[PDB]
């Protein structure tokens with residue numbers, strides 16, 4: 156049976172979805188305040204990202220309507236440049252999870268068509284893929300000012316391409332992404348398992364040396380070391396080794412404690428200089444640590460997971476709206492009148508990002524401590540109070556520190572329905588539901604089977 160908090164998640168989903176249906180059907184993103192839409196892919200991004208969430212939440216009439224759109228209206232031949240990583244985690248991942256949950260081969264046929272159109276990105280001298288590929292013309296290229304790719308982008312596509320090869324029997328997808336993983340396994344320039352942010356597609360070597368973050372441009376590299384190891388049945392020992400090494404590197408170089416509360420946080424390093432800056436993106440890490448412990452990683456990882464979960468919770472609850480900003484800074488020394496969680500004026504936006512509630516899901520699944528459910532519910536209520544648009548939809552907001560004037564940005568990111576609400580529903584579940592023994596979630600919350 157659905158419980159009270161799950162019913163609340165479903166009310167939020169359906170209010171979001173009614174805005175999408177009325178004002179943005181088949182378009183990439185809802186602009187709820189203006190009752191319009193935006194495109195970047197032109198491939199119904201929000202719809203595809205939400206397929207599996209609709210299925211899991213039991214929204215089967217909505218799923219059927221969306222399936223009909225996929226069957227009739229989703230076509231990949233347009234002259235359009237797409238980012239390989241964003242494409243892969245949202246569209247390829249979303250189609251693959253929709254296939255597995257529904258059993259409907261339409262989703263696999265579409266995934267295979269799309270996957271084939273992404274392949275030109277790998278045709279570089281080093282076989283590290285370009286950032287962008289045109290799905291209609293077959294031309295791939297790097298950004299205008301550089302031949303570098305982003306490290307997280309080239310190392311956070313593996314689950315999806317590996318699974319596509321498994322289902323289709325076409326080895327080209329797996330072979331391409333595994334070359335990337337194996338190459339990066341042997342690269343110089345890491346700091347105790349920590350990777351630089353960029354990698355050159357011509358030389359194959361890291362660039363921006365000596366600069367280390369667990370946030371944007373590197374985060375999901377670490378996530379996918381563990382998750383690939385799990386996906387593959389725990390036989391690919393190099394992935395585990397590199398993951399274990401990296402977590403020790405985080406402990407050695409990036410962990411400090413805040414004032415006044417002594418919260419454990421992860422900062423950044425540049426040429427040996429520590430910076431107390433932490434992207435909300437880093438909040439994936441407690442959940443990934445806990446996931447690893449479920450699968451046999453050391454208890455030290457759980458100690459760190461629980462400390463970081465508290466911190467990520469505080470990043471939300473110390474704000475006036477109860478919603479974390481995009482980026483926080485912490486103080487290493489006591490500052491009269493100051494909270495733990497400092498926020499630069501420019502960083503005060505919230506884009507409805509999932510990483511805190513993602514990690515709460517894993518902490519709850521692994522520990523059973525109901526406080527993590529309570530924290531998730533608190534955060535959901537804050538989304539409802541400060542980001543809801545009366546006519547339908549929820550919006551990113553510009554100011555998490557002004558409860559009277561949060562200032563909507565007029566955008567509902569696809570990951571709100573793809574991730575934030577899926578993880579909350581799962582967090583609250585009393586159930587055999589997407590077992591950690593049977594599935595691994597991709598980095599856009601799309602569950603894929605463990606082999």
Ligand SMILES: CO[C@H]1O[C@H](CO)[C@@H](O)[C@H](O)[C@@H]1S[C@H]1O[C@H](CO)[C@@H](O)[C@H](O)[C@@H]1O
Pocket residue numbers: 305307308370371372373374375436508509510570574598599
């Ligand atoms: C700017 O940050 C984004 O892109 C870089 C890659 O250039 C990633 O390293 C970073 O994690 C995010 S994408 C990340 O977050 C989104 C939700 O907040 C969502 O698309 C997905 O979870 C993805 O992993």
Ligand SMILES: [Ca+2]
Pocket residue numbers: 375439598599
């Ligand atoms: Ca993610």
